[PDB]
Amino acid sequence: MRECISIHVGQAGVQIGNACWELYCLEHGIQPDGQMPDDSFNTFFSETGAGKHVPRAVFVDLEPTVIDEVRTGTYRQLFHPEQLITGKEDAANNYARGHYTIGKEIIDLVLDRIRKLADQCTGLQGFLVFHSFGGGTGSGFTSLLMERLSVDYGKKSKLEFSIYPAPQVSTAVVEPYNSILTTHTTLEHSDCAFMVDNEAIYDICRRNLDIERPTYTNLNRLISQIVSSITASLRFDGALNVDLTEFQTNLVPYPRIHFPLATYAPVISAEKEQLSVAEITNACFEPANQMVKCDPRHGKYMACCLLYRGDVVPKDVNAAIATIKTKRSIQFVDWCPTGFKVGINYQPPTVVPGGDLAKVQRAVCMLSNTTAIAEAWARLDHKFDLMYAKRAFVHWYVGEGMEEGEFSEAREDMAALEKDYEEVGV
Amino acid sequence: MRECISIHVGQAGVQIGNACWELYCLEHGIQPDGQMPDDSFNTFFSETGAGKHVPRAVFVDLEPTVIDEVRTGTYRQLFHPEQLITGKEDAANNYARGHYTIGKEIIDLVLDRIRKLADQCTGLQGFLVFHSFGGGTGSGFTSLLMERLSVDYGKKSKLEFSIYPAPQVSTAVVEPYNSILTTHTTLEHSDCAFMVDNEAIYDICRRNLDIERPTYTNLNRLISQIVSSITASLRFDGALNVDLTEFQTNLVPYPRIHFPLATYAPVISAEKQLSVAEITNACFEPANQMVKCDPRHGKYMACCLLYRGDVVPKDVNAAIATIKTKRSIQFVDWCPTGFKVGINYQPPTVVPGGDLAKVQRAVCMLSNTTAIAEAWARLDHKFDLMYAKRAFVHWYVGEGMEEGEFSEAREDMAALEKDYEEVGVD
Amino acid sequence: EVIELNKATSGQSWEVILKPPSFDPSLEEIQKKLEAAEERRKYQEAELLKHLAEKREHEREVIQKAIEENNNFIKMAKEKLAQKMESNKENREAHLAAMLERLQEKDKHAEEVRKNKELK
Amino acid sequence: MREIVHIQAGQCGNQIGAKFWEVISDEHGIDPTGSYHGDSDLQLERINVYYNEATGNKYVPRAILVDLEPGTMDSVRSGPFGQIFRPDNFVFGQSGAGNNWAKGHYTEGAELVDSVLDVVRKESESCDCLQGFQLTHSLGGGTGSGMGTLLISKIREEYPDRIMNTFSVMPSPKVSDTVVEPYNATLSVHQLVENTDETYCIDNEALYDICFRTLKLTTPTYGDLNHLVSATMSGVTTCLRFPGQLNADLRKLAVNMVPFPRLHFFMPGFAPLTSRGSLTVPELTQQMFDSKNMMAACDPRHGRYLTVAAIFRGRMSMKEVDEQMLNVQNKNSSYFVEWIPNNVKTAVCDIPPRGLKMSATFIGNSTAIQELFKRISEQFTAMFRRKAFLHWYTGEGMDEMEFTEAESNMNDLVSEYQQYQDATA
Amino acid sequence: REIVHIQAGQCGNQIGAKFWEVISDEHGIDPTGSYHGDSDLQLERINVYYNEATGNKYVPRAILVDLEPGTMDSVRSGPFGQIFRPDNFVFGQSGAGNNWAKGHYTEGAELVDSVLDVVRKESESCDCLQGFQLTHSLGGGTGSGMGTLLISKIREEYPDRIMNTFSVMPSPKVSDTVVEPYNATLSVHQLVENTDETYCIDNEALYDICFRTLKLTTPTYGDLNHLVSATMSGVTTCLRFPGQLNADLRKLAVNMVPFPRLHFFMPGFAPLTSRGSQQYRALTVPELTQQMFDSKNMMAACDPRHGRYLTVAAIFRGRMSMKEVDEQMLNVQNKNSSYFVEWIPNNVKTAVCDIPPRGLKMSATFIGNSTAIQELFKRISEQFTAMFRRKAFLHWYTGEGMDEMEFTEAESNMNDLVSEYQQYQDATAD
Numbered sequence A: 001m002r003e004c005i006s007i008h009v010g011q012a013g014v015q016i017g018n019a020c021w022e023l024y025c026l027e028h029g030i031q032p033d034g035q036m037p038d039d040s041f042n043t044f045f046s047e048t049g050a051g052k053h054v055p056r057a058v059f060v061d062l063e064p065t066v067i068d069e070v071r072t073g074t075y076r077q078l079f080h081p082e083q084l085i086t087g088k089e090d091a092a093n094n095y096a097r098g099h100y101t102i103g104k105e106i107i108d109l110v111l112d113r114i115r116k117l118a119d120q121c122t123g124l125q126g127f128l129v130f131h132s133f134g135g136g137t138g139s140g141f142t143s144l145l146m147e148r149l150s151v152d153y154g155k156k157s158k159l160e161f162s163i164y165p166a167p168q169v170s171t172a173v174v175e176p177y178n179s180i181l182t183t184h185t186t187l188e189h190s191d192c193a194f195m196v197d198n199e200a201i202y203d204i205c206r207r208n209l210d211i212e213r214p215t216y217t218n219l220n221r222l223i224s225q226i227v228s229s230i231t232a233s234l235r236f237d238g239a240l241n242v243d244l245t246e247f248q249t250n251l252v253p254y255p256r257i258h259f260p261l262a263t264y265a266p267v268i269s270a271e272k273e274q275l276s277v278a279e280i281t282n283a284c285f286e287p288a289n290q291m292v293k294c295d296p297r298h299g300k301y302m303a304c305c306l307l308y309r310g311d312v313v314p315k316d317v318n319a320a321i322a323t324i325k326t327k328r329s330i331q332f333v334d335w336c337p338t339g340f341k342v343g344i345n346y347q348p349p350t351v352v353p354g355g356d357l358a359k360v361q362r363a364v365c366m367l368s369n370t371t372a373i374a375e376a377w378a379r380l381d382h383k384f385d386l387m388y389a390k391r392a393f394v395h396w397y398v399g400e401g402m403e404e405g406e407f408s409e410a411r412e413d414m415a416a417l418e419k420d421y422e423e424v425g426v
Numbered sequence B: 001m002r003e004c005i006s007i008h009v010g011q012a013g014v015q016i017g018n019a020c021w022e023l024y025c026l027e028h029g030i031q032p033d034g035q036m037p038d039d040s041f042n043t044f045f046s047e048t049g050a051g052k053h054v055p056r057a058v059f060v061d062l063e064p065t066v067i068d069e070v071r072t073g074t075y076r077q078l079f080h081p082e083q084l085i086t087g088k089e090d091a092a093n094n095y096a097r098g099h100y101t102i103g104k105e106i107i108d109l110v111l112d113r114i115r116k117l118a119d120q121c122t123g124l125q126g127f128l129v130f131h132s133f134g135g136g137t138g139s140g141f142t143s144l145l146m147e148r149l150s151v152d153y154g155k156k157s158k159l160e161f162s163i164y165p166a167p168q169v170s171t172a173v174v175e176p177y178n179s180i181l182t183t184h185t186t187l188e189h190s191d192c193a194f195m196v197d198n199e200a201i202y203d204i205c206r207r208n209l210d211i212e213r214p215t216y217t218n219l220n221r222l223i224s225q226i227v228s229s230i231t232a233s234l235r236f237d238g239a240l241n242v243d244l245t246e247f248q249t250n251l252v253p254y255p256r257i258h259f260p261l262a263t264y265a266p267v268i269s270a271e272k273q274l275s276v277a278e279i280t281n282a283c284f285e286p287a288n289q290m291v292k293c294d295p296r297h298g299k300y301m302a303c304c305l306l307y308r309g310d311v312v313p314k315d316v317n318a319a320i321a322t323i324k325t326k327r328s329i330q331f332v333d334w335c336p337t338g339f340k341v342g343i344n345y346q347p348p349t350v351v352p353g354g355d356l357a358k359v360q361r362a363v364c365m366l367s368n369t370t371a372i373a374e375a376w377a378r379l380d381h382k383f384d385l386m387y388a389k390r391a392f393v394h395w396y397v398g399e400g401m402e403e404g405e406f407s408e409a410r411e412d413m414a415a416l417e418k419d420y421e422e423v424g425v426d
Numbered sequence C: 001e002v003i004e005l006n007k008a009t010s011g012q013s014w015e016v017i018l019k020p021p022s023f024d025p026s027l028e029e030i031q032k033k034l035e036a037a038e039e040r041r042k043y044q045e046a047e048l049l050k051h052l053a054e055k056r057e058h059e060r061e062v063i064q065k066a067i068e069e070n071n072n073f074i075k076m077a078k079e080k081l082a083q084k085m086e087s088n089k090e091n092r093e094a095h096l097a098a099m100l101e102r103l104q105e106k107d108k109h110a111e112e113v114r115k116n117k118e119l120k
Numbered sequence D: 001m002r003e004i005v006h007i008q009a010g011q012c013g014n015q016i017g018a019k020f021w022e023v024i025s026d027e028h029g030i031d032p033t034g035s036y037h038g039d040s041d042l043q044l045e046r047i048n049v050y051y052n053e054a055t056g057n058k059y060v061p062r063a064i065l066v067d068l069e070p071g072t073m074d075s076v077r078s079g080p081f082g083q084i085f086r087p088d089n090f091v092f093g094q095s096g097a098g099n100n101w102a103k104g105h106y107t108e109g110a111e112l113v114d115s116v117l118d119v120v121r122k123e124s125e126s127c128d129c130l131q132g133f134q135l136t137h138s139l140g141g142g143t144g145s146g147m148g149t150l151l152i153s154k155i156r157e158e159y160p161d162r163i164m165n166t167f168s169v170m171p172s173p174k175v176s177d178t179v180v181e182p183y184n185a186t187l188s189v190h191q192l193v194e195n196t197d198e199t200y201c202i203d204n205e206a207l208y209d210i211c212f213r214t215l216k217l218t219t220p221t222y223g224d225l226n227h228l229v230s231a232t233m234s235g236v237t238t239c240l241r242f243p244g245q246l247n248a249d250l251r252k253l254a255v256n257m258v259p260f261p262r263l264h265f266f267m268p269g270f271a272p273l274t275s276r277g278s279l280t281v282p283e284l285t286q287q288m289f290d291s292k293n294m295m296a297a298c299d300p301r302h303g304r305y306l307t308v309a310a311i312f313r314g315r316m317s318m319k320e321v322d323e324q325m326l327n328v329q330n331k332n333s334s335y336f337v338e339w340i341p342n343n344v345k346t347a348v349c350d351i352p353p354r355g356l357k358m359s360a361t362f363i364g365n366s367t368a369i370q371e372l373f374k375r376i377s378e379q380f381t382a383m384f385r386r387k388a389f390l391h392w393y394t395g396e397g398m399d400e401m402e403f404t405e406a407e408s409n410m411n412d413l414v415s416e417y418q419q420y421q422d423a424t425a
Numbered sequence E: 001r002e003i004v005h006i007q008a009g010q011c012g013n014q015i016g017a018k019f020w021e022v023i024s025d026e027h028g029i030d031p032t033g034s035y036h037g038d039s040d041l042q043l044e045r046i047n048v049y050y051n052e053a054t055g056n057k058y059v060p061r062a063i064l065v066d067l068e069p070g071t072m073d074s075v076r077s078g079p080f081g082q083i084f085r086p087d088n089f090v091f092g093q094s095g096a097g098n099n100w101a102k103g104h105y106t107e108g109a110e111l112v113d114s115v116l117d118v119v120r121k122e123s124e125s126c127d128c129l130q131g132f133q134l135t136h137s138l139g140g141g142t143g144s145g146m147g148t149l150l151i152s153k154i155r156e157e158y159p160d161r162i163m164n165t166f167s168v169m170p171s172p173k174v175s176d177t178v179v180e181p182y183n184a185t186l187s188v189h190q191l192v193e194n195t196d197e198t199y200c201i202d203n204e205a206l207y208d209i210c211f212r213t214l215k216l217t218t219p220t221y222g223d224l225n226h227l228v229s230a231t232m233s234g235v236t237t238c239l240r241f242p243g244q245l246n247a248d249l250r251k252l253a254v255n256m257v258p259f260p261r262l263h264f265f266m267p268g269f270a271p272l273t274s275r276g277s278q279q280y281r282a283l284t285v286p287e288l289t290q291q292m293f294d295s296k297n298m299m300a301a302c303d304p305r306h307g308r309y310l311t312v313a314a315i316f317r318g319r320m321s322m323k324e325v326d327e328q329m330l331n332v333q334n335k336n337s338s339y340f341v342e343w344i345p346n347n348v349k350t351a352v353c354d355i356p357p358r359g360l361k362m363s364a365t366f367i368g369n370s371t372a373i374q375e376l377f378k379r380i381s382e383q384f385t386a387m388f389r390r391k392a393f394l395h396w397y398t399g400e401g402m403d404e405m406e407f408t409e410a411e412s413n414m415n416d417l418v419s420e421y422q423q424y425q426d427a428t429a430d
């Protein structure tokens, strides 16, 4: 049995965690009290002597507000109180505060709970980590946690799901700083990180769901659909991406270039005819459906996987794949084969009942490692340079014990990554 | 708390004190036995166990005559007998008898009584001293006393109320001498001195009050209303209040420049209602000043307006707004704002049998103008006329003084005139 | 070109190929950096409480100075009044001494007038 | 990260302090007897931020009322909500401060300050996690200016890690109680530069000018000025007091609004400007960057914004709020620094302020605030180059060079502001 | 505030007795010492001049002194003679032969211890002695010689006390005794040194007033003493009666004597009347003020317009408008500015007492410190020199033990006095 452990750090990670575990319980028929009227779900859910199923999850925040809504909420009975860890005072959007000041005070406790979940595993694969780039806890504590998890579980995979900041979705002035800082610290410790751009998700909610101003519930439910596609491989007895190690093998030919672009289709408004395998497929190469804003035809591909879901027949898939070859000019790097790994997972896509998504008989999620995602880094790098040339806000970080040198070091790493992407797409 | 102790020296001081304490007992409802049918009057009256309210005042004179009228008059049971102190022989219009020969025999008695009044205080604000420039006692004994109070009480506020001599009102030939001598030795010891030109009071009585030949009771009752205004801030609760410290710091820009010009309005004959604007404007008309001088040819360094009665701050604001426009009224360059405002609720009380009319509202302005130097100039000239011939000096030398002290006192007055010139420089 | 990969209960996976490729720290290091940051935080805090302490000392020096100023103003007043009062006493006593000596010199003369009357 | 401790010092501090509590007690449904009678539970969600719960389920402000003078706190106790305040949190001396900053800071204030710090130390131990301190006070007088800055210095020594935030009223010769206001204000701006994390600059020059010029009040009174001040203090704290989109406290505000430690003085603004007794979203957005709406008498078009916070109150589409805020930004691009991306932030709250169906409050960190300090500095130099009224300060034990140090530092703050006005990208 | 009154010699006891008669009537005291008066204003300052006897009687604080026993029987004979304490009568048996040296050095010195006994007893009965006043002539031997000796001895014992004299100046019109200029010059010597204020009563001016104005062909001492008594009443009014004035002898001396030697006052009085004579018209206030700077109303034979006033005190008595009184007094000063020194500002003072003297509805007394008083001292000095040039009568004086040199010194000193009066007469404020 191939157990995975989910870690949800800070506000964004806790609220995306809420949305995923909600969908998981709906997908596997687990009620909010953990009762349940294919046994691959046990990779994500343990079982107690009372017959209840408990997520293999830990929720971490340096502030009690968000997790208190888990403690008192609809799924309050699903988690045991040990799995929910709060401090009293948050990181105030300050990476060095979450990483050096408070993080030093709560890390050993968090590792202790992780150590305990890991002891209920006969074959732990590793960790899924959810966090924002922008918050002080999501950037600062997460990067401290990754450092420690590498020390304590060396041969174990870590996959990140990272919220990339956007001015349209409640961002703060200092989030470029936090983003570059945590990316520096966690690069060598993550094996595969799926970035979620809040602007991309917000755009998708507006255009396809007709919600002029999406809520966090809106964005997180749409995010969970994407996360669900990626983990459905692990939670059901699928054939593509059956273990955490397979993501590196299939999507990350070069270690630092481990940031794949997810694409999902279709997103149909519940308020508002079933789409073929071929229509959801060529809608995988339209930038509007990307989780990160970039132009993949001004880049090159190193890997590409299609995760189908629902009533999808293999001949339809090949029929679609042949059509887009002649219809679309997509470029792979010289040293990679030009083609696709295809997975069908027969479980239908599931939507939260009453939510804003519509139930569909078939859906697809495409995972690609493209050099085009470099321009998301370029955008952050530029906002970092504007503020750092004037040393703006740096004094908050130095006051927590960080050295101004860490800023230029982190920014030099981001430069190296930007030209790593340059070099492989030469 | 916030007690003030009053010292009345010599005939002029004692008789004015009579008018003042008769006014306070009326303003607060204290009958002449100190019984009484807002406890701010306790700054000026202590209370005995039997409910007897007793002035915090000493009356002193080197001759017993004037204080014997107190000891036998209406208010003879208002003061304890130890507060009324008399010697046998006056100072015969000779400063040096008041300061040395006669005064040195009673000074220790006077400080011991004062010490006992101070011992009944838990927040002594300062001393108010009433005396004449011209008397041998008013000049010489007040100088002795101010020196001795600075030794006993350090830098504690000492404010004077000084009667300035006038030929129209029982002045004597040697009063110029006594005025300069007391001003010299008292400069270093007083923190603020309010001069009352007997000619100015005299003229107000004949012009506004239609009294052919004013008597002291006429003059002193007028003076009392002005003193009452200044002290009203300290004995009443009020809307905008001004303690003794606020006085000194808002009116005295340099230690030696401490002789504010007092103005009062309205002064209406009893046998004959004015606006806040009307009385405010009349504080800048020279007919109502307590010293004869012309401020229209001087410069203002500070103005303090004390309103009593039915006065609304919005009306004081509108009225002071008018004053700031009239450039007949010139402030020095270095005074960005020279206005402090007091407002107390209780209208001026009129003594029955007096000559002033009850009014709903009045105002007393204290202004520090360079133009008060004109009053020093008139005294110095009379000093010089006589001193050039050494007329009358032998009376002072006989009591042990030196001519040395005469020129020193006159040179200090030269420097004071030069100080008033320089502070009006732009 | 299709290539079958795997089949299972809840799905199957394969691969499609169009063109082939053109071309064939330590725990102690971690806690070392965190203890160093913690000792920079505590050193900056030490510096702040040091400057605040320096301001406490200045404040009680100002209050002391105002006390000393007031005591020096009493001490100057006291000795200047003493010098004044004793100078007036020596002068007034001298005037009286001189006035009495002139009167007594006249009394000497009057006894001399009397004795001179007894010669005649 | 929840509770605020509030301190009002001196006459002015206690007047606007009272008016503030009067305003937020009405917004949260707290009556003067201390008990609650509102209709939305949004009024109780963050009530603990500013209030303590009493035994009889009554709410008691977390307020400490300070004066060296007894008169004003009799006046507070007599006001409308005078009974709501804890009788133990009044700390009043007996002498007054004599309009003198040296008396407030050195001699009289030092003898009352530890009695104040005990009451502070007690209210803060009654906190689960203390977010910070907020102080209301004037800089022109002696108690709020001198003892207030003494308080701040001593609170910082006992709570080094806590946010200190002041609401500081700026003197003006248009509404002056005392002739030494420039000395008092300059000596304490020195202190605020050193020891506060956010200061809201309330300019009496601007309040008077709004009342006179826009509100057509011939003769402004402190009641009028304070009507504008309390509206601004309500708006500025709306996100602390009410649940909303924002999960943020005073520390996160300091982080995102203060790019350089000394540059932490904010221009407050408000719209609509109203008179006691007696608008469209586009108009709201526009008059918020209008000079006529700044509570600091500076023209923002004379400088550039480092950072701006705006909050809109009332029912209104956020789509139209955001569209107008971006239009204004892009229209006036040369008044925002380009080296701080997305430096204009907007929050909306459904609950409109009492008496108004819509409003907007503005917090801007602008290089144009240097005009305020230049003004204090020129009045300072006009008196000080003649040593006028100086002996009242040296008499308290102060040395002249404390004065020159204070103006030198304030002239450094001006040039510091000017340096970022001229910085390019 | 008690005064001790001493009268010495014939003239001293005659004008001293007249003084007591006049103020006793003003104060309601009859010759027995009982008070028979109408108003308590008579009694308020009665202790200045009278002691309170048991029996509700009042005894003048008076010391009567003469070397000749004669005149002190006629004072006992005089009306009010029984009013004086008998123990205060100190008299010898040999006169002084109009010889100052007998008064000062020989016969007078033997009797002076006994009068100091009385003075010590009267003054230590006082609670606060103001000072002393002495009535005497300067032309005789007892008043001049023994009187100035008494002053010197009282100086020794009471050096902080004021000394005041009413000094009668000789004149050839009145007395024929040729050595009166010698006695007056020796006396003035002493007075310059040892008194604080001296009223100069000139027998020359008293004679001229009686002869020229009162048309008395052959005036007598009684005629002349009427004008002395009116004046002494006038100048003591504000010591004796409560008025505006809160003042004693020392306050008077401080404001009237700007230089120590220049303390000789020129008294004046209006209206002038002869004794026991009904006045058929009281003067008006304009008349009083005018006739008071008129040389005909001076009691010293000097024209005021020949000099300058250093200081002037004017006392008006009667029911009159203080409006009109202060009006005229300013007029007088303005019209006649060139007679007041400009370097003593406000040097004319005016008091009004409602109590008029007996026989007048209104009167005025003038006390002027004028440089014209040098015309008096010159006249004495001229008469002195005309005798001394020839050593006339010197053996009356050296026979008593004096030396010529003492005469030379007194002449020097009086010429010095004339010189200083002229120095200040000629001084400008420039």
Ligand SMILES: Nc1nc2c(ncn2[C@@H]2O[C@H](COP(=O)(O)OP(=O)(O)OP(=O)(O)O)[C@@H](O)[C@H]2O)c(=O)[nH]1
Pocket (backbone or CB within 6 Å): A009, A010, A011, A012, A013, A015, A016, A062, A090, A091, A092, A093, A094, A132, A133, A134, A135, A136, A137, A138, A139, A163, A164, A165, A166, A169, A170, A171, A172, A175, A198, A216, A219, A220, A223
């Ligand atoms: N998609 C999505 N993004 C979120 C959510 N909550 C916060 N974010 C984003 O995360 C960033 C802010 O960081 P937070 O996670 O909220 O901060 P934190 O990790 O709790 O650390 P602190 O600064 O101490 O609060 C912003 O870019 C937000 O837009 C969420 O529920 N869904």
Ligand SMILES: Nc1nc2c(ncn2[C@@H]2O[C@H](COP(=O)(O)OP(=O)(O)OP(=O)(O)O)[C@@H](O)[C@H]2O)c(=O)[nH]1
Pocket (backbone or CB within 6 Å): B009, B010, B011, B012, B013, B015, B016, B062, B090, B091, B092, B093, B094, B132, B133, B134, B135, B136, B137, B138, B139, B163, B164, B165, B166, B169, B170, B171, B172, B175, B198, B216, B219, B220
């Ligand atoms: N306004 C007013 N002035 C007075 C009064 N009494 C005296 N004066 C003035 O004070 C000066 C006289 O000084 P006094 O006070 O009488 O003398 P003294 O202080 O008692 O001292 P002595 O010289 O010892 O009598 C003159 O200018 C008088 O006009 C008074 O009752 N009211």
Ligand SMILES: Nc1nc2c(ncn2[C@@H]2O[C@H](COP(=O)(O)OP(=O)(O)OP(=O)(O)O)[C@@H](O)[C@H]2O)c(=O)[nH]1
Pocket (backbone or CB within 6 Å): E008, E009, E010, E011, E012, E014, E015, E067, E068, E095, E096, E097, E098, E099, E137, E138, E139, E140, E141, E142, E143, E144, E168, E169, E170, E171, E174, E175, E180, E203, E206, E221, E222, E224, E225, E228
């Ligand atoms: N006006 C006035 N002058 C008098 C009177 N009696 C004497 N004189 C003058 O005084 C001078 C003489 O002085 P006396 O008083 O007679 O002498 P004395 O002081 O008593 O000394 P002896 O007579 O020598 O014992 C002469 O000028 C007299 O004219 C008097 O009653 N009235």
Ligand SMILES: COc1cc2c(c(OC)c1OC)-c1ccc(OC)c(=O)cc1[C@@H](NC(C)=O)CC2
Pocket (backbone or CB within 6 Å): A170, A171, A172, A173, A174, D236, D239, D240, D246, D248, D249, D250, D252, D253, D254, D256, D257, D307, D308, D309, D310, D311, D342, D343, D344, D345, D346, D347, D363
């Ligand atoms: C406690 O109340 C506030 C707290 C903060 C902010 C704020 O303005 C909207 C507040 O209301 C006045 C805030 C301000 C400005 C920012 O940039 C200038 C920012 O990046 C970010 C913020 C806040 N974050 C967001 C996403 O608005 C956190 C700090």
Ligand SMILES: COc1cc2c(c(OC)c1OC)-c1ccc(OC)c(=O)cc1[C@@H](NC(C)=O)CC2
Pocket (backbone or CB within 6 Å): B170, B171, B172, B173, B174, E235, E238, E239, E245, E247, E248, E249, E251, E252, E253, E255, E256, E311, E312, E313, E314, E315, E346, E347, E348, E349, E350, E351, E367
């Ligand atoms: C006890 O009797 C008198 C005492 C004095 C004065 C006086 O003349 C009016 C007297 O009556 C004769 C007096 C005299 C002269 C002054 O100026 C020449 C003066 O300034 C002042 C005075 C007197 N003071 C006043 C105010 O008149 C004090 C001394």
Ligand SMILES: Nc1nc2c(ncn2[C@@H]2O[C@H](COP(=O)(O)OP(=O)(O)O)[C@@H](O)[C@H]2O)c(=O)[nH]1
Pocket (backbone or CB within 6 Å): D009, D010, D011, D012, D013, D015, D016, D097, D099, D138, D139, D140, D141, D142, D143, D144, D145, D169, D170, D171, D172, D175, D176, D177, D178, D181, D204, D207, D222, D223, D225, D226, D229
């Ligand atoms: N805005 C406003 N300013 C005030 C108020 N009261 C006083 N001030 C200003 O505060 C300064 C005087 O300080 P004040 O508080 O009276 O003295 P303190 O008690 O020593 O702090 C001057 O600038 C006053 O105009 C008020 O109610 N509102």
Ligand SMILES: [Mg+2]
Pocket (backbone or CB within 6 Å): A010, A011, A063, A090, A135, A137
């Ligand atoms: Mg958070």
Ligand SMILES: [Mg+2]
Pocket (backbone or CB within 6 Å): B010, B011, B063, B090, B135, B137, E246
């Ligand atoms: Mg007196």
